[PDB]
Structure formats: structure tokens, C-alpha cells
DNA sequence: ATGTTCATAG
DNA sequence: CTATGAACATT
DNA sequence: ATGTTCATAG
DNA sequence: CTATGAACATT
């Protein structure tokens, strides 16, 4: 790595944590939800991308799965996520501020140097 | 595309324009120069990357080359760049502010939503 | 899309 | 030993 | 690294 | 028709 700007991967990973920290949801939902909180700014991620973030937070030993099967019209086997390791959860939820803080400087530096 | 953050490619492209707008230099120089203006922030790009940016601004019909051969110890056939199309130069030097302005919002949005 | 290694040139 | 590229390889 | 298409499951 | 994945493909 050269340490440019934050990867989309890590960016989403962080939204999951935050959203899990409260809403406690499943993939396809998050996607739709994020697609609304960024619609205006024109950032539209995709399920596959959203999914990969979740799966990653698995091997990182954090968010663990938790499958649910209910009865009725929306008869899905929807998959929710909760915290596995909360220690790592806030360990990561900070080494990500650092990157967002570092990545801001650039967009500023650029926006200033060039303009 | 999904319109996440600005690619490194376009980021550099912009520095070239700006730097050409005044300094008028050659590849390996820019690299070393950029490596100093970002050292502190910890962003260290590479020649290959810097090079690709230049070459790209070629087919975009803008920066045109201009090879020079002098005599003495540093006997290089160093390759400088100047403006081909200045109309496109400021056309692009704005659709890049738009991306830097758009890409800032995110790092803010993130840094705010999550924190 | 971008980083790491190899080619040629002086 | 510097400069400019391209091929190769990875993410 | 990330986007676009295909597989399976209800 | 939605949900979750993985394979495939591109940048």
C-alpha cells in the first residue's frame, strides 16, 4: 500500500459496526438504507459490495451471524448480525477515524494546493 | 462506476496540470516533489503511477511532450510537458473540484454519522 | 485500479 | 545511477 | 479492489 | 419477487 484515500471496503465496514451498534439489521436492508443516506450525495453502492464487508467482519472475529426463520408472507430466512468481539469493535472503530481524518486532509490539501 | 471517492489517477492528473501551469517539469521530478509535499501526511505515490497520469493527459489532447537533450554530467534525455489544449485544461480543472467537493462531503458524512 | 518488477537508454 | 516506459501481477 | 452477472433458496 | 452468496470479469 501507498496510503492514499480510504478504500470503499473499510468505509462500509464502519457503517455496519455503527448500524449494528443500534439498528441490528441484515444485508439487503443496509444496502437500501445506505442507498438512501447517500442518494443525495450520489454514492450508490451495491449488495455484493455490502455483503463482502459483512463477511470480512466475520473472520475479523467480530460481527457473528444469527439466522432467523419466521412464518408469513415475507417468509425469508433473513440473516442478521450482532457483535462477536466488542473489544475489536472499538479498536477498529478508531483506526478508522484515523483514516477518515487522514483522508480528509488530502481532499483539503488538494482542494487548496490546486485551487 | 458507483461514484465513491476520487481515484488516485485523477488526483495526480490534477497535480500535473497545476504544476505544469507553472513549474513545467518531467516525470521523476514530480514524483520526488509530490513525495515531499505529502511525506508528512504519509502518502507516497510511485513513478509508474505518476507516469500513467501524464500519458493519460496525452490522449486527452492536453499536455503535449517536448523532449530535451543537453550536454554535461546529468546527460539525460529528460522529457518535459507543456499544454496542448488549455480549453480542456480548465474544463477538467473544474470537473475535478466537483469531485474533490463531492468526495469531501463523504469523509465528513462518515466522520459525522459514525462519530 | 494500482502496485512491484523488468527493459532500454544515457 | 537517473529517467522513462512497459510487462507482469495483485487487490 | 470493486463492479456485473449467475445460483440457490424460499 | 427478495435474500444471500459466489463466479466471473474489469479497472
From Swiss-Prot, chains A, B:
Function per UniProt: Plays a role in DNA replication and termination (fork arrest mechanism). Two dimers of rtp bind to the two inverted repeat regions (IRI and IRII) present in the termination site. The binding of each dimer is centered on an 8 bp direct repeat.
Keyword Hydrolase recorded: no
Recorded GO MF terms: DNA binding
SUPFAM superfamilies: Winged helix' DNA-binding domain (SSF46785)
The organism's place on the tree of life at top rank: Bacteria
Entry protein name: Replication termination protein
UniProt KW keywords: DNA-binding
GO biological process per UniProt: DNA replication termination
Quaternary structure note: Homodimer.
Pfam families: RTP (PF02334)
Record has rRNA-binding as a keyword: no
